[PDB]
Design an enzyme around this catalytic site. Structure first.
Site, PDB file in Angstrom:
ATOM      1  N   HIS A 108       0.784  -1.332   0.035  1.00  0.00           N
ATOM      2  CA  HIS A 108      -0.071   0.109   0.121  1.00  0.00           C
ATOM      3  C   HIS A 108       0.786   1.499   0.100  1.00  0.00           C
ATOM      4  CE1 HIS A 108      -3.103  -2.878   1.597  1.00  0.00           C
ATOM      5  NE2 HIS A 108      -3.786  -2.141   1.058  1.00  0.00           N
ATOM      6  N   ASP A 183      14.893  15.879   8.734  1.00  0.00           N
ATOM      7  CA  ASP A 183      13.367  15.717   8.688  1.00  0.00           C
ATOM      8  C   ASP A 183      12.898  16.507   7.383  1.00  0.00           C
ATOM      9  OD1 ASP A 183      10.550  15.731   8.870  1.00  0.00           O
ATOM     10  OD2 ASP A 183      10.498  16.135  10.915  1.00  0.00           O
ATOM     11  N   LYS A 185       9.718  15.309   6.024  1.00  0.00           N
ATOM     12  CA  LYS A 185       8.511  15.034   6.046  1.00  0.00           C
ATOM     13  C   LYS A 185       7.622  15.798   6.649  1.00  0.00           C
ATOM     14  CE  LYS A 185       9.774  11.204   7.979  1.00  0.00           C
ATOM     15  NZ  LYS A 185       9.875   9.805   8.863  1.00  0.00           N
TER      16      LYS A 185
END
Ligand SMILES: [Ca+2]
Ligand SMILES: [Ca+2]
Ligand SMILES: [Ca+2]
Length: 481
Positions: A108, A183, A185
């Site tokens: 997924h 980071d 995200k």
């Protein structure tokens, strides 16, 4: 003739799940074992998979996770069709597997990519399967501020030179929730943290309009209560609009007999934002999984208002009763299969609308008796030029996707590992094979298709690999429109 123009190796290190299939309870409860093969919960091939290839001007953007099991990094490759050269960016994020169990592969959790044709920003969405702030990772990482995973670039990044196509082009998380210096995200697309809006999301799929607007849709919720949400990139503001529901959640209290979930895809087709889908009602009935076949389109260039069914009638928006958008009942194809779960619809659904307004939908409807498929029925439903009778025939080959370019629709696939193209005039069911790679060419195990400017971009996994690192290719095939 349809002609192969280019064949390009992308990597020899694409991640592959070389282990065995695991149940969901197995995947959730079992601990890691060092030296194990890379087991998996759904499919074994996460690359190429998902919305993983786009073409913008002379650039082909392709995403993939890198192998093997101890690597799993998110990768972005850009191939320049003018120079024949490629450059790749490694992102810090690594595939987190099934609910944080990174040694169980989770197909997924694809990496979707898009380019804004307006400001040339690059957008990445990855490694999501309906996670939320209280997702239980079983001791594998803290997901409380990482349940939605978005990366994006400076304006102009899509067209920098190869040597400048680096992580320097991408924007770090500098919010109060930032993990630190690597980071990349972001927990939101709107600049506003919003757990209600960005939790329980799966299947990132971007699409673009004629005029260069960029949109995204995802599924929100569960298989018992699910909706499609979609938004638009606001290039002038460097952010996205708030997600908008195509259909409601909690339909069982808003006008429908029961909650339901939605299995389909929005696309930009013949100049409009549209959707085709099937429904999962989870009633104790003849339908093991999905039922029905549905379609709607928007006459609004933003896709927000003016939603209509195939007859042109306005539908309720956000939709509550899927039947407003009905085109066909696939249960009809097995009219005597009335026992519990005897009609099994679990995949094989797709649709398109040609540049001449021909509407086409396909499905796979299986008969399910003593816990086994005993009959597979493939259907093709089509309406020439957007008017007249909807024709449904089961005289259709085992194809799972439909594509379109010019006046035609296409089936594109692998036969004995070799790419083929079958073509039919839109509004018809009359296919002929118009391309088949020759004997002695390479064999492929899986491919994903992107049609752009009259050409087929085939992103392919080479067959016969071993272990958790495999080889992928890009083929560029001229459809001779
Ligand atoms: Ca972050
Ligand atoms: Ca059912
Ligand atoms: Ca025309």
């Amino acid at each position: 003739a349809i002609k192969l123009e280019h064949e390009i190796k992308v990597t020899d290190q694409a991640l592959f799940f070389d282990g065995v299939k695991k149940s969901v309870p197995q995947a959730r409860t079992q601990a890691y074992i060092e030296g194990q093969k890379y087991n998996y919960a759904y499919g074994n091939a996460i690359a190429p998979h998902g919305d993983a290839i786009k073409v913008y001007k002379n650039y082909v953007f392709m995403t993939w996770y890198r192998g093997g099991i101890l690597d799993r990094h998110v990768m972005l490759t850009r191939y320049n069709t003018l120079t024949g050269k490629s450059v790749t960016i490694e992102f810090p994020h690594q595939h987190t597997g099934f609910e944080g169990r990174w040694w169980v592969g989770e197909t997924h959790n694809t990496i979707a990519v898009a380019i804004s044709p307006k400001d040339e920003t690059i957008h990445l969405l990855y490694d999501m399967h309906a996670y939320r702030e209280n997702t239980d990772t079983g001791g594998n990482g803290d997901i409380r501020k990482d349940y939605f995973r978005y990366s994006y670039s400076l304006a102009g990044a899509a067209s920098v030179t190869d040597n400048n196509f680096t992580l320097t082009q991408f924007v770090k998380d500098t919010s109060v929730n930032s993990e630190g210096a690597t980071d990349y995200k972001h927990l939101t697309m709107t600049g506003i943290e919003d757990h209600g809006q960005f939790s329980r999301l799966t299947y990132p799929t971007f699409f673009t309009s004629h005029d260069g607007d960029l949109f995204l849709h995802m599924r929100q919720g569960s298989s018992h209560d699910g909706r499609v949400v979609f938004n638009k990139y606001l290039a002038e503001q460097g952010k996205w609009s708030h997600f908008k529901s195509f259909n409601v959640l909690g339909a069982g209290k808003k006008g429908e007999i029961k909650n339901w979930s939605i299995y389909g895809k929005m696309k930009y087709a013949d100049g409009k934002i549209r959707i085709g889908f099937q429904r999962r009602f989870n009633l104790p009935d003849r339908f093991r999984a999905q039922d029905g076949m549905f379609y709607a389109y928007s006459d609004d260039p933003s896709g927000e208002t003016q939603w209509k069914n195939y007859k042109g009638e306005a539908i309720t928006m956000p939709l509550v009763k899927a039947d407003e958008a009905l085109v066909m009942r696939p249960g009809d194809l097995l009219p005597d299969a009335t026992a519990k779960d005897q009609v099994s619809i679990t995949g094989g659904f797709d649709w398109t609308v040609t540049e001449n307004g021909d509407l086409h939908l396909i499905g796979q409807t299986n008969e399910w008796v003593n816990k086994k498929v005993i009959k597979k029925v493939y259907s093709h439903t089509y309406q020439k030029a957007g008017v007249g009778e909807l024709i449904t025939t089961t005289d259709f080959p085992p194809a799972s996707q439909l594509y379109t370019a010019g006046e035609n629709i296409y089936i594109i696939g692998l036969e004995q590992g070799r790419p083929f193209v079958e073509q039919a005039k839109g509004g018809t069911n009359d296919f002929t094979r118009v391309y088949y790679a020759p004997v002695g060419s390479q064999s492929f195990q899986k491919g994903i298709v992107h049609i752009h400017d009259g050409k087929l971009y085939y992103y392919l996994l080479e067959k016969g690999g071993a272990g958790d690192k495999r080889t992928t290719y890009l083929q560029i095939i001229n459809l001779d429109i």
